[PDB]
Structure 1
Amino acid sequence: HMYIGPEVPKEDLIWQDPLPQPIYNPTEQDIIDLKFAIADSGLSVSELVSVAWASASTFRGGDKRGGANGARLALMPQRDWDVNAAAVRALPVLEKIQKESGKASLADIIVLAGVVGVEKAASAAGLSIHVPFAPGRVDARQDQTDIEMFELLEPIADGFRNYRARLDVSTTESLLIDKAQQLTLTAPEMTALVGGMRVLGANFDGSKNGVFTDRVGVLSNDFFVNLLDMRYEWKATDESKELFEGRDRETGEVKFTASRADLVFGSNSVLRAVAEVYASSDAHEKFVKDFVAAWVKVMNLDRFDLL
């Protein structure tokens, strides 16, 4: 025997010292294992969706900064932002999962969590769908973050989580459009994300505003069906016109509450045309497929390495 054969693969070698900052290269089986770990973590759909959104939603198309790479949600100041309060209570579990595994960055794991969330919400609505996921993100550390000569702004508003920091007479609807264009979303993709994320229970503070469904955590088209249902009549609750009550016209009962961010989807002609497609009988699969595309789009905004 002359030993001139192919080099045994690195996956077969018994031992190799841990790098103090490992390069990761998760295998398909690595990703599958992480998925099961996340699904069995006891994190809810809403939390899985929340933590994923919070990490990714900082992207600015204007200059191409922000997004889920680097995992700044785990660092200051993002970890402490009011709007991220719900998201951040899920981090410690992914942090532990990341350590036990050592197969992927925390940056990747955060987005994987969103993938698992959307998949579960989909099966709860009677659909098996594959949510695309690309590994490769890295974790930034606190100092690397502190030195950077660009600035990411704590958001005055994020309509996708029905968050509005203070009223200053810039309208909530225009602030939602601003966020959306920062993320380079089209009007249809913005529309699927809002409706999706509403019924998923992704409001920053657990409020029921715009949550037009009795089955939270299920990726249905409930939001759209109930928003366009003429059975309901919509009234402002006071002079601000920031908050609305939807009452059954047949029985008088107050069924829903809503903010301006929710109501605009039925109160602008273009958005409404989109909403009425998603409301359609038998448009559920189509909605789910547009929500997924939109969601994955947002999750990948900053992935210039996937050149």
Structure 2
Amino acid sequence: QDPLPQPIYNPTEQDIIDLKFAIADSGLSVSELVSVAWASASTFRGGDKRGGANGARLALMPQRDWDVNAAAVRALPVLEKIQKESGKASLADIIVLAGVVGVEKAASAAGLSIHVPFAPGRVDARQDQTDIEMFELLEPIADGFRNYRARLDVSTTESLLIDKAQQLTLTAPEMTALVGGMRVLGANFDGSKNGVFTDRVGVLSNDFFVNLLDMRYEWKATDESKELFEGRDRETGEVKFTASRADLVFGSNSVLRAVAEVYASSDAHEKFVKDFVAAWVKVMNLDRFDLL
């Protein structure tokens, strides 16, 4: 017996206000904030009752030591210290809240004060409620939201992104708003420039789409494996951007460019930000009221 029950929390509105203040002032960047929240939520699979942000299992084994999560796991200790210092909310709630602050900061930097809806109520799992063997199964072969791809395989990078979006129950418009925003917010798991079509990383703009759609660039594989692409300015021939298949599908799948061309420019900046926020929140809440 590890005797006492976990604390029961009932954050009030003002509790949440102060936890946002604490998180905003912690020196954590927009990239670190968005990565930790995404690493938490993104284990959800439709139909399985294991993944999702409830439980803060990112803080435990084995998710804490997954390669994909190394960036996310660098914010944890800051957030773990904030949670212990306040004891008004569970770390699971505070991880998701970090995502909220990070997205609100990104949009502010873009000139918009969006409110990002937050549902309180999550609890923390103990390691001895977190069967290590069962959770290893969910370690991702790929997360194209963070441009991660293990085990260059028989299966297609592009095909694994679709599978992951399907696991998350995302629409094509949601999956698209999410990839585009996560690129420019700096969510790539290893800081790669792939897909990062912007000179203002950490600002929630629609740059991914403006630039991906821009016909001034011509895209070519860097070799036979065809997993890495350079995009060159057609007049100079000078490489301007690089991309993986998970970036390029939004141009190169007629059907995904369709959804992709909506956001690709402008006065369109505010609708992309609203759809981003709706999608992000939807992912954050997949294990709230999951019917299956």
Q: How far did residue 146 of structure 1 move?
A: 2.0
Inter-partner Cα distance in structure 2 for 1:255 and 1:122: 25
For structure 2, the residue ranges without an aligned partner over 5 or more in a row are none
Q: Deviations over 1:54-84 (max 9, x none)?
A: 0000001022431000000000000000000
1:242–1:150 Cα change, 3 Å: closer
4+ runs of 1 displaced by more than 6 Å? 16-19, 147-151
Q: How far did residue 193 of structure 1 move?
A: 0.2
| Matched-pair contact (CA < 8 Å) for 2:61–2:132 | no
| Matched-pair contact (CA < 8 Å) for 2:39–2:69 | yes
1:250–1:95 Cα change, 3 Å: same
Of the structure 1 ranges 141-150 and 214-223, higher mean CA displacement relative to structure 2 is found in 141-150
Q: How far did residue 240 of structure 1 move?
A: 0.3
| Matched-pair contact (CA < 8 Å) for 1:51–1:110 | yes
Residues matched between the structures, number:
292
Q: How far did residue 274 of structure 1 move?
A: 1.3
Q: How far did residue 277 of structure 1 move?
A: 0.8
TM-score, with structure 1 as normaliser: 0.91
Q: Deviations over 1:148-182 (max 9, x none)?
A: 97774210000000000121121100000011100
Q: How far did residue 306 of structure 1 move?
A: 11
Q: How far did residue 254 of structure 1 move?
A: 1.0
| Matched-pair contact (CA < 8 Å) for 1:56–1:68 | yes
Q: How far did residue 212 of structure 1 move?
A: 0.4
Of the structure 1 ranges 139-148 and 73-82, higher mean CA displacement relative to structure 2 is found in 139-148
> SS of the counterpart of 2:204?
coil
| Matched-pair contact (CA < 8 Å) for 2:206–2:264 | yes
**Rg larger in structure:** 1
Q: Deviations over 1:101-150 (max 9, x none)?
A: 00000000000000000000000111010000010000001001128977
Q: How far did residue 250 of structure 1 move?
A: 2.1
Of the structure 1 ranges 272-281 and 49-58, higher mean CA displacement relative to structure 2 is found in 272-281
| Counterparts of residues 182-261 of structure 1 (less than 5 Å) | 182-261=167-246
| Matched-pair contact (CA < 8 Å) for 2:44–2:52 | yes
1:148–1:238 Cα change, 3 Å: closer
Of the structure 1 ranges 59-68 and 230-239, higher mean CA displacement relative to structure 2 is found in 59-68
Inter-partner Cα distance in structure 2 for 1:97 and 1:210: 33
Of the structure 1 ranges 99-108 and 265-274, higher mean CA displacement relative to structure 2 is found in 265-274
Q: Deviations over 1:164-208 (max 9, x none)?
A: 012112110000001110001011100100000000000000000
Inter-partner Cα distance in structure 2 for 1:288 and 1:214: 18
Inter-partner Cα distance in structure 2 for 1:18 and 1:288: 46
Inter-partner Cα distance in structure 1 for 2:132 and 2:146: 30
**Percent sequence identity over aligned pairs:** 100
| Matched-pair contact (CA < 8 Å) for 1:50–1:202 | yes
> SS of the counterpart of 2:70?
helix
1:285–1:145 Cα change, 3 Å: same
| Matched-pair contact (CA < 8 Å) for 1:56–1:66 | yes
Inter-partner Cα distance in structure 1 for 2:136 and 2:230: 38
Inter-partner Cα distance in structure 1 for 2:212 and 2:146: 17
Q: Deviations over 1:262-287 (max 9, x none)?
A: 00000112211111110122111110
| Matched-pair contact (CA < 8 Å) for 1:58–1:152 | no
Q: Deviations over 1:81-105 (max 9, x none)?
A: 0000000000000000000000000
Inter-partner Cα distance in structure 1 for 2:135 and 2:187: 28
> SS of the counterpart of 1:256?
strand
Inter-partner Cα distance in structure 2 for 1:161 and 1:229: 23
Inter-partner Cα distance in structure 2 for 1:73 and 1:150: 11
> SS of the counterpart of 1:257?
strand
1:18–1:155 Cα change, 3 Å: closer
User: Which of these residues, 9, 12, 20, is aligned with residue 35 of structure 1?
Assistant: 20
TM-score, with structure 2 as normaliser: 0.96
| Matched-pair contact (CA < 8 Å) for 1:193–1:295 | yes
1:163–1:151 Cα change, 3 Å: closer
Inter-partner Cα distance in structure 1 for 2:149 and 2:250: 17
> SS of the counterpart of 1:292?
helix
Inter-partner Cα distance in structure 2 for 1:288 and 1:64: 30
| Matched-pair contact (CA < 8 Å) for 1:212–1:227 | yes
For structure 1, the residue ranges without an aligned partner over 5 or more in a row are 1-15
CA RMSD of aligned residues (A): 2.5
